[PDB]
Amino acid sequence: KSLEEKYVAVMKKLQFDTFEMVSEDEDGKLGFKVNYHYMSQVKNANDANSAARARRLAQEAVTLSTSLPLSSSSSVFVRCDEERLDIMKVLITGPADTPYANGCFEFDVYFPQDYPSSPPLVNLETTGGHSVRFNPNLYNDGKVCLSILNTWHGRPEEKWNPQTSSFLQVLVSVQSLILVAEPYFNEPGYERSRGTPSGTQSSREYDGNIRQATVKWAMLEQIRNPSPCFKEVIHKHFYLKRVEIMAQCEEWIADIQQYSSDKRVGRTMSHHAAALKRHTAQLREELLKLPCP
Amino acid sequence: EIDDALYSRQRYVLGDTAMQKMAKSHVFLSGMGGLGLEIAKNLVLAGIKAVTIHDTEKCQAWDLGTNFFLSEDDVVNKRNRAEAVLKHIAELNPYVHVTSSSVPFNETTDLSFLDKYQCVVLTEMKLPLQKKINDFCRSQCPPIKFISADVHGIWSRLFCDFGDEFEVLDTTGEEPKEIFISNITQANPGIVTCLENHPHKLETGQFLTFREINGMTGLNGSIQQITVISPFSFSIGDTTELEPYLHGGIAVQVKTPKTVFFESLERQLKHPKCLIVDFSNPEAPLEIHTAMLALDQFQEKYSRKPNVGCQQDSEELLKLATSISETLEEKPDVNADIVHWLSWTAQGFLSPLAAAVGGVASQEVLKAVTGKFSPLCQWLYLEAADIVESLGKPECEEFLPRGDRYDALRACIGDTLCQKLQNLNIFLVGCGAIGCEMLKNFALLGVGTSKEKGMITVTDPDLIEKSNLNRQFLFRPHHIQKPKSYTAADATLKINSQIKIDAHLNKVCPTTETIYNDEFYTKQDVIITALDNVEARRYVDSRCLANLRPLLDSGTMGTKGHTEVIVPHLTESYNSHRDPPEEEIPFSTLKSFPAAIEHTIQWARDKFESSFSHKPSLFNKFWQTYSSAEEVLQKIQSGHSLEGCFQVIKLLSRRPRNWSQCVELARLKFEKYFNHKALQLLHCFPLDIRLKDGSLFWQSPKRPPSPIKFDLNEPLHLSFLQNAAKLYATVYCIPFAEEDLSADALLNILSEVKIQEFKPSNKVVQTDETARKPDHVPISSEDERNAIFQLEKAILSNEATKSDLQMAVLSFEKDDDHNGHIDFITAASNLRAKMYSIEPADRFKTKRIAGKIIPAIATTTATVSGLVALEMIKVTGGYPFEAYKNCFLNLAIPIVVFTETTEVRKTKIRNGISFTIWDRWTVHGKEDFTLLDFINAVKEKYGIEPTMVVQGVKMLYVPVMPGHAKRLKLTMHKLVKPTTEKKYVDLTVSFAPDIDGDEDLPGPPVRYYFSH
Ligand SMILES: O=P(O)(O)O[C@H]1[C@H](OP(=O)(O)O)[C@@H](OP(=O)(O)O)[C@H](OP(=O)(O)O)[C@@H](OP(=O)(O)O)[C@H]1OP(=O)(O)O
Ligand SMILES: Nc1ncnc2c1ncn2[C@@H]1O[C@H](COP(=O)(O)OP(=O)(O)OP(=O)(O)O)[C@@H](O)[C@H]1O
């Protein structure tokens, strides 16, 4: 797989890097260069930083720079401010064989003043104006519900642990739990409807809606509105991977055509299929328009 | 009736019965020195029914250093001291009937009149007539409680005698313990195993009672004496004849009075029962006893105190002590140094030592009239010894009188040290009773009175309250709702006009660090704290550690207290203390399975705050986020996932419009809380449901509750409904009147109210003891459409105005009665107690627990303040490490323990290099100085190469971060981009650990001066 070889070779150099995200004025107040979520929290953060916080971040930095998962199924890309580590931004592509597949999702992360005593704040940025609850644990505004973040129910081993938990663990958990091929039954109660024909039918409905929303935002709006933090990286990734998506869109269109005949959920699959085919045509246009950086 | 609004904190210490006896007590005091003055102060603050003071002396200028009510006018008029200051003492408490007397006391003085009193305290008194008075006291029927104390220089004496037999009604104020029984056997003696994870925490010979025990129904209500087998098992005596054991059971501690025996004062002159406060000197108290007896004999022989530095007097006192030691039962070695120091400081007076001994003596007096705690038996000696030996051998002229009010202190510590105290700059945080006592000590000591240098600063953000008047003696009722610091400082100058003091209304916190910058801390010499929380302590500790200044702290709770001393380059920081965090009640236990009344009170408090603070905040924040309910309706119609909108709509659909509907909603809430929840939980868990092993689910500690049937005629129900209706009317801004609260009107309102029938549900129960409050279960579309219909109907009914989008948010007031928060919480807690068949609780313990009220008393604060003044004197002396003594105490036992402060540790960073918490490294450079030059300079001066650099919250350099080799070439000013405010900058640097993969070891903070 020459495509796989080049994919691994190129983005290896791009999975980690620093990038100044906050320009600084004369009086010590922060002027944010690009979009970010914790405007007021960062600006109001106390300047009495705990030394253990910085030391833990520095110790993490080695692993976070050397051991980022890299594969054509999914990869992680890591950027932080060139003068502050607690401001954080991460980009992830969707694992293959999922409704999320190859979709680019940007995150905002901030490490609290008491870190590592508490998990860092995590947030979705590819919300499309908070249009869609893309994952049952992932609210439309972007708020993240993970037991490791203490933002989801779970046993103590599933909770945040200042002594053992690592940011890389959260990164991996994103792919392993949120970015799955099976999001619908993750909603509490639907895991009981797993296997039931009605539950699986509603799962097909939800996953088709998620597929069309991903095609809209995570691919079409991402390429049409590239983010500065990964502008060259995303275009190179899309140039490399595009051969897959031009068939992924067609297979999804073929799947939703089978659903559309259904009288309960296929009626909504008709609207989602119209949206899907429109965005697929537009995405093919953009792929033809896509240059190689 | 007890004035609870003034005495709540004292009630939480003593108990109502002790004060009820206290309201029938007459206490007499003789001698009116500073010690007697403070005794009167503490007793009048405690609120004795009647106090009689006595004095045969007249005012002198020398008394101005020991009294904080006297004025120059009183000395000029040559008035009797007690009768002069009597008017001032009456200000402290109007309830106390304070009287005075001046009848001369001598060998022919009749003592029969003293029978009207229950306890008599003697100060400034000749020992033989003390013997006679003690003989009279214990010969009475019942005997009059006898207490005597003395203060002489840096030495003090305290003695107690309650006759041949005295009854202690309660040994200690600790709450009796209750323990679930896991196992118990029919044996001779029977063996009891408590809950396997819960420690027994009891001792052999104690008495226990038993309740709710299954198997042996006969053990219910029985009392046995126990014998500990293990920290989880014990024996209670024969139980073989009993019926077989089944399960459950609770053992409740039983308190028993104990008789304590006191010898006569004369008979205690030999073999005195002396309390020990320093285990390293288990003989010093006896030596001090011998020395005090020698001093008394010298005063008897020569009718005068020894002169300072008088070799003849010192030798005579040595001979007297040697002779007395020979007559003693044990004959201890006479301490020549102690005798020398006593002779040196015989004529002097030390007020902080007086403060400590007066506090402990007042606590003993309180014990004498209540029997609430085990008293001293029979002797206790306190010293300020460490001060004098640190000065070597000074001259007598250092202590000779000079005519001012400070002559008494000068004879004790010397003029130079007094001048040092006068020059000090002091920062004091917190204006509590501890702070007030410390300020009084400063004023009497001449602290900061130097017209040039000395300067005091205090600050506190709160105003004065009536409850504060019980222990903050500086204040008066006409000072309520006025700044504590301002009033305290204003009153201080009346004690001493020479003091120079400044005050602020500021809360010490990171935001106020601008006012209290590093330069301000450098201007200060000593920082003292009277805080009530740990976070502020840690903040002040960190600031003082950064500024390299000594810090003093003291904690006070009930009769327990402690003193913390922190000295630069000598001691650990307060942050070095790492006491275990409090473990809170399990979430499942709190919500679903309470067993303690504290669980129910916590549940009631949390429900109160959720209903009246949290949810109101959510509602108003929702209406601030979204302009109109129509907007939210449109958005949810388009599937917008707004937050809290469902709860806001549910509140609006439940919104009352008149008082009757508020009462209806309160009744519905009552039904929900105390009937429906029981039926739900019993539907999930039947009374006879069983576990994997077949044991009943409803077994200890899991109490199966029983649903409650409403009855307005029940006073508890009436109070609950009234308070809930009032709070809800405040919530919805519905006006009302007191007549609406009348029971008949409420019955009329509820007469037409239909009680909704219960229906079960299948909600999963978080039975996990390690569980926590999770996020909500996702909401069904049924609730979505129901709420949609609700706000659609509301809009159609015009219930969408801004007023409909408005409702009050209530703070948790805990002191006033009219707000009804305390009554509401008490009613809910008692309903929940009856709910789970747990015993109810009274209003005042509910107020204590819910408000987190720390019990307080004047005796403890005075005792700790005297000590604190002592170690700050030691700090002013610049004394070696050995002199500084931390202290812990618990007057309940009573017990006092001194211990040297914890030695500062050295952090071995690498290669034999070590540094302390007080260490801050320095580097000097220039504008062309670079980061590589910085690394070289560190590797040269301290022999270790930096591995990582941090600019505060910003990172400065990390080797693994991209392109940071170039930063080594950049100059300090270019890369820091500093302001012109400083000639330096502070950074954080760590170093590579000995084992790779480990975190870099943190070093001390480093300061790079921009110049040399
Ligand atoms: O949210 P909390 O104040 O912590 O308490 C809630 C609340 O009861 P209140 O309405 O009396 O405050 C719920 O009601 P809503 O907030 O939704 O109005 C109620 O749920 P239901 O209305 O569905 O009965 C729930 O009870 P439960 O957890 O048993 O479902 C109950 O919990 P607690 O009173 O035990 O805290
Ligand atoms: N950060 C702070 N800065 C200044 N003063 C503080 C700070 N934190 C607490 N205090 C003060 O500490 C004092 C502690 O004294 P005290 O024991 O009387 O407490 P309280 O809260 O007033 O009393 P109570 O518990 O009886 O209501 C308070 O008066 C409070 O104003």
Tab-separated table of N, CA and C in Angstrom, chain A residues 202-288:
chain	number	residue	atom	x	y	z
A	202	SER	N	-34.201	2.552	14.364
A	202	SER	CA	-33.873	3.903	14.796
A	202	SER	C	-32.369	4.143	14.768
A	203	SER	N	-31.574	3.094	14.975
A	203	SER	CA	-30.128	3.215	14.838
A	203	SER	C	-29.749	3.559	13.405
A	204	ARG	N	-30.382	2.892	12.440
A	204	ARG	CA	-30.152	3.220	11.037
A	204	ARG	C	-30.543	4.661	10.748
A	205	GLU	N	-31.685	5.095	11.284
A	205	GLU	CA	-32.113	6.480	11.100
A	205	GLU	C	-31.073	7.457	11.640
A	206	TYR	N	-30.656	7.251	12.890
A	206	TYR	CA	-29.701	8.146	13.532
A	206	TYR	C	-28.370	8.153	12.794
A	207	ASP	N	-27.897	6.977	12.379
A	207	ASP	CA	-26.596	6.899	11.727
A	207	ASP	C	-26.638	7.497	10.328
A	208	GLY	N	-27.766	7.371	9.627
A	208	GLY	CA	-27.896	8.048	8.346
A	208	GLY	C	-27.906	9.557	8.492
A	209	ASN	N	-28.637	10.060	9.490
A	209	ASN	CA	-28.614	11.493	9.763
A	209	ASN	C	-27.203	11.953	10.105
A	210	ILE	N	-26.498	11.172	10.925
A	210	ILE	CA	-25.133	11.513	11.307
A	210	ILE	C	-24.215	11.495	10.094
A	211	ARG	N	-24.403	10.521	9.204
A	211	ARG	CA	-23.599	10.438	7.990
A	211	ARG	C	-23.775	11.683	7.134
A	212	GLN	N	-25.028	12.077	6.895
A	212	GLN	CA	-25.258	13.252	6.060
A	212	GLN	C	-24.747	14.518	6.739
A	213	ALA	N	-24.889	14.612	8.065
A	213	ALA	CA	-24.359	15.764	8.788
A	213	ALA	C	-22.838	15.815	8.712
A	214	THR	N	-22.183	14.657	8.799
A	214	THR	CA	-20.732	14.600	8.680
A	214	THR	C	-20.283	15.025	7.291
A	215	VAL	N	-20.974	14.539	6.259
A	215	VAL	CA	-20.651	14.947	4.894
A	215	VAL	C	-20.801	16.455	4.749
A	216	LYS	N	-21.867	17.010	5.329
A	216	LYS	CA	-22.086	18.452	5.280
A	216	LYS	C	-20.956	19.211	5.969
A	217	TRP	N	-20.767	18.970	7.266
A	217	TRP	CA	-19.872	19.806	8.069
A	217	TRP	C	-18.431	19.309	8.039
A	218	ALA	N	-18.210	18.072	8.483
A	218	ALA	CA	-16.866	17.551	8.699
A	218	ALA	C	-16.054	17.418	7.421
A	219	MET	N	-16.688	17.344	6.253
A	219	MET	CA	-15.917	17.267	5.021
A	219	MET	C	-16.126	18.503	4.157
A	220	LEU	N	-17.377	18.770	3.778
A	220	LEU	CA	-17.647	19.844	2.827
A	220	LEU	C	-17.351	21.210	3.432
A	221	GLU	N	-17.899	21.485	4.615
A	221	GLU	CA	-17.655	22.777	5.243
A	221	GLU	C	-16.233	22.881	5.774
A	222	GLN	N	-15.599	21.748	6.071
A	222	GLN	CA	-14.210	21.783	6.512
A	222	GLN	C	-13.284	22.185	5.371
A	223	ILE	N	-13.453	21.567	4.199
A	223	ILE	CA	-12.606	21.931	3.067
A	223	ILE	C	-12.957	23.322	2.553
A	224	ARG	N	-14.246	23.662	2.496
A	224	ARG	CA	-14.651	24.982	2.029
A	224	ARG	C	-14.311	26.083	3.024
A	225	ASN	N	-14.144	25.742	4.304
A	225	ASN	CA	-13.700	26.699	5.319
A	225	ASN	C	-12.539	26.113	6.120
A	226	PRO	N	-11.349	26.041	5.523
A	226	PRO	CA	-10.204	25.423	6.210
A	226	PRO	C	-9.823	26.186	7.471
A	227	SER	N	-9.393	25.444	8.487
A	227	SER	CA	-8.966	26.047	9.746
A	227	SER	C	-7.482	26.392	9.682
A	228	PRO	N	-7.076	27.572	10.156
A	228	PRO	CA	-5.655	27.954	10.065
A	228	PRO	C	-4.710	27.015	10.798
A	229	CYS	N	-5.145	26.425	11.915
A	229	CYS	CA	-4.259	25.579	12.707
A	229	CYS	C	-3.785	24.349	11.945
A	230	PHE	N	-4.565	23.872	10.976
A	230	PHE	CA	-4.186	22.699	10.197
A	230	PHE	C	-4.461	22.885	8.711
A	231	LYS	N	-4.374	24.115	8.202
A	231	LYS	CA	-4.855	24.394	6.853
A	231	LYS	C	-4.119	23.575	5.801
A	232	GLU	N	-2.791	23.506	5.880
A	232	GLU	CA	-2.049	22.690	4.926
A	232	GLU	C	-2.223	21.204	5.223
A	233	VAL	N	-2.293	20.846	6.507
A	233	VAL	CA	-2.383	19.439	6.891
A	233	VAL	C	-3.681	18.830	6.382
A	234	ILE	N	-4.795	19.543	6.565
A	234	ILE	CA	-6.089	19.005	6.157
A	234	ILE	C	-6.153	18.851	4.643
A	235	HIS	N	-5.621	19.825	3.902
A	235	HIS	CA	-5.647	19.729	2.447
A	235	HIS	C	-4.771	18.585	1.950
A	236	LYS	N	-3.597	18.393	2.556
A	236	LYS	CA	-2.763	17.255	2.179
A	236	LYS	C	-3.458	15.937	2.500
A	237	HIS	N	-4.100	15.867	3.669
A	237	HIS	CA	-4.835	14.671	4.058
A	237	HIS	C	-5.955	14.365	3.074
A	238	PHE	N	-6.698	15.393	2.668
A	238	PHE	CA	-7.808	15.183	1.749
A	238	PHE	C	-7.312	14.810	0.360
A	239	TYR	N	-6.187	15.387	-0.067
A	239	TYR	CA	-5.590	14.977	-1.332
A	239	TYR	C	-5.188	13.510	-1.298
A	240	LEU	N	-4.590	13.067	-0.192
A	240	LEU	CA	-4.159	11.677	-0.093
A	240	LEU	C	-5.351	10.727	-0.025
A	241	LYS	N	-6.346	11.059	0.799
A	241	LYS	CA	-7.426	10.130	1.101
A	241	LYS	C	-8.606	10.232	0.142
A	242	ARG	N	-8.613	11.221	-0.758
A	242	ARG	CA	-9.827	11.554	-1.501
A	242	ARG	C	-10.373	10.365	-2.280
A	243	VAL	N	-9.491	9.471	-2.734
A	243	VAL	CA	-9.928	8.326	-3.531
A	243	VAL	C	-10.922	7.478	-2.748
A	244	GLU	N	-10.756	7.414	-1.427
A	244	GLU	CA	-11.677	6.645	-0.600
A	244	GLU	C	-13.034	7.331	-0.479
A	245	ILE	N	-13.047	8.653	-0.279
A	245	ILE	CA	-14.302	9.349	0.003
A	245	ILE	C	-15.210	9.368	-1.221
A	246	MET	N	-14.637	9.492	-2.423
A	246	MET	CA	-15.479	9.479	-3.617
A	246	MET	C	-16.248	8.173	-3.783
A	247	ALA	N	-15.832	7.101	-3.112
A	247	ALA	CA	-16.586	5.854	-3.064
A	247	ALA	C	-17.404	5.712	-1.789
A	248	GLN	N	-16.918	6.294	-0.694
A	248	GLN	CA	-17.648	6.284	0.570
A	248	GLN	C	-18.984	7.006	0.446
A	249	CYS	N	-18.987	8.157	-0.231
A	249	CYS	CA	-20.228	8.893	-0.445
A	249	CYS	C	-21.206	8.066	-1.271
A	250	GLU	N	-20.707	7.401	-2.313
A	250	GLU	CA	-21.579	6.586	-3.151
A	250	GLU	C	-22.148	5.397	-2.391
A	251	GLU	N	-21.336	4.733	-1.563
A	251	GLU	CA	-21.862	3.606	-0.796
A	251	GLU	C	-22.904	4.072	0.216
A	252	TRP	N	-22.676	5.234	0.842
A	252	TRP	CA	-23.673	5.779	1.762
A	252	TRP	C	-24.964	6.135	1.032
A	253	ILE	N	-24.852	6.697	-0.174
A	253	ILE	CA	-26.038	7.012	-0.968
A	253	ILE	C	-26.793	5.737	-1.318
A	254	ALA	N	-26.056	4.690	-1.696
A	254	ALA	CA	-26.688	3.412	-1.994
A	254	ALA	C	-27.393	2.841	-0.772
A	255	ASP	N	-26.776	2.959	0.404
A	255	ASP	CA	-27.387	2.444	1.627
A	255	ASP	C	-28.684	3.176	1.952
A	256	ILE	N	-28.663	4.509	1.894
A	256	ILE	CA	-29.842	5.280	2.278
A	256	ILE	C	-30.978	5.076	1.284
A	257	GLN	N	-30.663	4.695	0.043
A	257	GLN	CA	-31.721	4.366	-0.906
A	257	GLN	C	-32.512	3.147	-0.454
A	258	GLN	N	-31.836	2.150	0.119
A	258	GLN	CA	-32.541	1.001	0.675
A	258	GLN	C	-33.427	1.414	1.842
A	259	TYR	N	-32.941	2.331	2.681
A	259	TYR	CA	-33.719	2.774	3.832
A	259	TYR	C	-34.957	3.554	3.408
A	260	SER	N	-34.852	4.340	2.332
A	260	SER	CA	-35.880	5.323	1.996
A	260	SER	C	-37.259	4.708	1.789
A	261	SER	N	-37.336	3.444	1.366
A	261	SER	CA	-38.636	2.813	1.163
A	261	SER	C	-39.393	2.604	2.470
A	262	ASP	N	-38.701	2.648	3.605
A	262	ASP	CA	-39.336	2.417	4.897
A	262	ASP	C	-40.335	3.525	5.206
A	263	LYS	N	-41.470	3.147	5.802
A	263	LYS	CA	-42.520	4.119	6.088
A	263	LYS	C	-42.307	4.854	7.406
A	264	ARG	N	-41.499	4.312	8.317
A	264	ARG	CA	-41.284	4.954	9.620
A	264	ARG	C	-40.058	5.862	9.582
A	265	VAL	N	-38.894	5.287	9.283
A	265	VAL	CA	-37.655	6.054	9.253
A	265	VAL	C	-37.196	6.374	7.835
A	266	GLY	N	-37.644	5.617	6.832
A	266	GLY	CA	-37.230	5.897	5.468
A	266	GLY	C	-37.792	7.203	4.944
A	267	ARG	N	-38.894	7.668	5.533
A	267	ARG	CA	-39.436	8.977	5.197
A	267	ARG	C	-38.459	10.092	5.568
A	268	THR	N	-37.827	9.977	6.738
A	268	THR	CA	-36.776	10.921	7.109
A	268	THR	C	-35.504	10.648	6.317
A	269	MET	N	-35.248	9.372	6.013
A	269	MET	CA	-34.117	9.026	5.162
A	269	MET	C	-34.250	9.630	3.776
A	270	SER	N	-35.468	9.952	3.340
A	270	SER	CA	-35.622	10.637	2.060
A	270	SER	C	-35.026	12.039	2.110
A	271	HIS	N	-35.356	12.804	3.155
A	271	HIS	CA	-34.776	14.131	3.325
A	271	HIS	C	-33.267	14.042	3.511
A	272	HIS	N	-32.822	13.098	4.343
A	272	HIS	CA	-31.393	12.935	4.567
A	272	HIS	C	-30.677	12.488	3.300
A	273	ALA	N	-31.350	11.729	2.436
A	273	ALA	CA	-30.745	11.290	1.187
A	273	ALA	C	-30.652	12.437	0.195
A	274	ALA	N	-31.668	13.300	0.161
A	274	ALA	CA	-31.578	14.500	-0.662
A	274	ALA	C	-30.399	15.362	-0.226
A	275	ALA	N	-30.286	15.602	1.083
A	275	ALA	CA	-29.151	16.360	1.599
A	275	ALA	C	-27.837	15.660	1.277
A	276	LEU	N	-27.807	14.335	1.433
A	276	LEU	CA	-26.587	13.569	1.215
A	276	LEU	C	-26.136	13.650	-0.234
A	277	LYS	N	-27.062	13.500	-1.180
A	277	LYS	CA	-26.683	13.539	-2.589
A	277	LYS	C	-26.265	14.945	-3.004
A	278	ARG	N	-26.953	15.970	-2.491
A	278	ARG	CA	-26.546	17.339	-2.787
A	278	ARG	C	-25.131	17.607	-2.283
A	279	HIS	N	-24.879	17.271	-1.016
A	279	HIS	CA	-23.555	17.481	-0.448
A	279	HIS	C	-22.513	16.584	-1.099
A	280	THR	N	-22.912	15.415	-1.603
A	280	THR	CA	-21.974	14.542	-2.300
A	280	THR	C	-21.551	15.150	-3.629
A	281	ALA	N	-22.508	15.706	-4.373
A	281	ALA	CA	-22.165	16.398	-5.610
A	281	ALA	C	-21.241	17.575	-5.330
A	282	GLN	N	-21.569	18.368	-4.307
A	282	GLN	CA	-20.723	19.505	-3.956
A	282	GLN	C	-19.334	19.046	-3.519
A	283	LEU	N	-19.271	17.954	-2.757
A	283	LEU	CA	-17.999	17.429	-2.284
A	283	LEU	C	-17.148	16.928	-3.441
A	284	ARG	N	-17.773	16.279	-4.425
A	284	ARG	CA	-17.036	15.876	-5.617
A	284	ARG	C	-16.513	17.083	-6.383
A	285	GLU	N	-17.321	18.142	-6.494
A	285	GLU	CA	-16.823	19.382	-7.086
A	285	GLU	C	-15.579	19.871	-6.354
A	286	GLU	N	-15.646	19.927	-5.023
A	286	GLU	CA	-14.515	20.425	-4.245
A	286	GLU	C	-13.300	19.513	-4.371
A	287	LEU	N	-13.521	18.197	-4.434
A	287	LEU	CA	-12.417	17.267	-4.657
A	287	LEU	C	-11.743	17.521	-5.996
A	288	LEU	N	-12.530	17.753	-7.048
A	288	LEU	CA	-11.943	18.155	-8.320
A	288	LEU	C	-11.225	19.494	-8.210
